[PDB]
Write a protein that binds this ligand. Structure first.
Ligand SMILES: CNS(=O)(=O)c1cccc(C)c1F
Ligand SMILES: CNS(=O)(=O)c1cccc(C)c1F
Lengths: 264, 265
């Protein structure tokens, strides 16, 4: 992959692998989400980051995902080339935004888009911070100056408030645990695992008849290596669902979400 | 990737990804196993296979993995390029063997090697059987004629008999279940999931202080999408060795057995 001419965005091609596809022989939304993260990491590495910046590594600050929104129009097939472009933007004290556009490399057609909201947080205390007084001028040089939005439409799905699912759930998958393949290099559960856990309470009949078009997920609290998760889904409708992940015991909320599915 | 000049083997390069690495900032053995499977798939495609032949698709026959043996000398770092060569050989009526060599693309040095034994199964009845000369003839052209072995050693760990771990296990991880990301495109549990389940009963202290050099895994029965697995490990030993068992958490039906060898970092 490479920074573009202007140095303000990053592009990378991926060939979809045999083990990356589901029952329709196209990429899973988990494979997509993993590629979004990989191109995000190659963007950071290209400009000298990693997404830590000098004064963050100093005060022990990290970027952590508050929110992920992905919309897929077509899932690439096994052996297809998908091109992903990614860029970041400041949203003032709130935090930072990373957006993605996915294209069919051959047709140059847009096959998906994604946006995500990141916040600061001290790694040790896990206390949510606001973007420094201004000292966070270290990274504005690497973002477009004028707004560039994968989701430009005022009042659009990517920004909607998600409510808390109420017991009893219509569906549940309980006792989900992460294995070592689910940890990142710093031994924290991978953001993509939570996507997989949310989708595990969708009934097989839906996954067999429908394709996933939209997923929005809030990250409230991290699941540790030795935590156990329950995944809850209720139909609210195309088929739409409301999602909740919570710790198997006390029922502490770790994620909430919505998905939208189209008949195949 | 491409077939080599003689079209008897297949080469492919992979750049190691951010999410494919462990605590060492190098590729997990599960990432490696997944790359072996991917390059194996691209070789099959390159010669007009599915890994079924015409006769196999007729008689409703598949190849299934009986055994996987991996030896890694060095795990490639995040952003490193690894080059994998793979080929198959007929083992007569017993089945087929697929072999792999892993190299540092830059230095050209051998960083790993693997071998696997495949047997024929009726899709529907799940009944193993000997290879028929008719089936054999259809793919023997695509294999070297003179033996080409990733593991030449006169007495090689790759072929050693694995015993059944004795209750009580020294260590265990209980209630392991597959999610949808553990299924392949035909909704069977991915062979690589079993590797990760075997490793889940190794204590964190070994993993933090050691590196996996060797893993041998026998595949006895398939775990189904709604099965639950128990993983059992006992120390059998500077080098730590373990004996492994995966079994269904209810009746305790065996799905896998294995051994691992670890060396101090
Ligand atoms: C993720 N958020 S970031 O670290 O603030 C950031 C902003 C701009 C460009 C890059 C590469 C970047 F990593
Ligand atoms: C698994 N063994 S195989 O499918 O019979 C086979 C034999 C030779 C070459 C190829 C590509 C092949 F896939």
């Amino acid at each position: 992959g490479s920074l573009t001419e202007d140095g303000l965005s990053y592009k990378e091609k991926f060939v979809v692998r045999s083990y990356e596809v589901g029952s329709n022989k196209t990429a899973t939304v988990e494979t997509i989400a993993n590629l979004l993260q990989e191109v995000g990491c190659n963007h950071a590495q290209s400009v000298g980051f990693s997404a830590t910046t000098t004064t963050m590594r100093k005060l022990h600050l990290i970027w952590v995902t508050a929110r992920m929104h992905i919309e897929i129009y077509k899932y690439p097939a096994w052996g297809d080339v998908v091109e992903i472009e990614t860029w970041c933007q400041s949203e003032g004290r709130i935090g930072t935004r990373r957006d993605w556009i996915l294209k069919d490399s051959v047709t140059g057609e847009v096959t998906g888009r994604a946006t995500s909201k990141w916040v600061m947080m001290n790694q040790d205390t896990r206390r949510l911070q606001k973007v420094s007084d201004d000292v966070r001028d270290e990274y504005l040089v690497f973002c477009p100056q004028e707004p560039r939005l994968a989701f430009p439409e005022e009042n659009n799905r990517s920004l909607k408030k998600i409510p808390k699912l109420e017991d009893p759930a219509q569906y549940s998958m309980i006792g989900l645990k992460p294995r070592r393949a689910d940890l990142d290099m710093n031994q924290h559960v991978n953001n993509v695992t939570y996507i997989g856990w949310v989708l595990e309470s969708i009934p097989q009949e839906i996954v067999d008849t429908h394709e996933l078009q939209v997923i929005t997920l809030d990250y409230r609290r991290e699941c540790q290596q030795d935590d156990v998760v329950d995944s809850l889904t209720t139909t609210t409708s195309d088929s739409q669902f409301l999602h909740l992940l919570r710790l198997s015991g006390d029922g502490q909320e770790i994620n909430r979400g919505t998905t939208l599915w189209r008949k195949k």
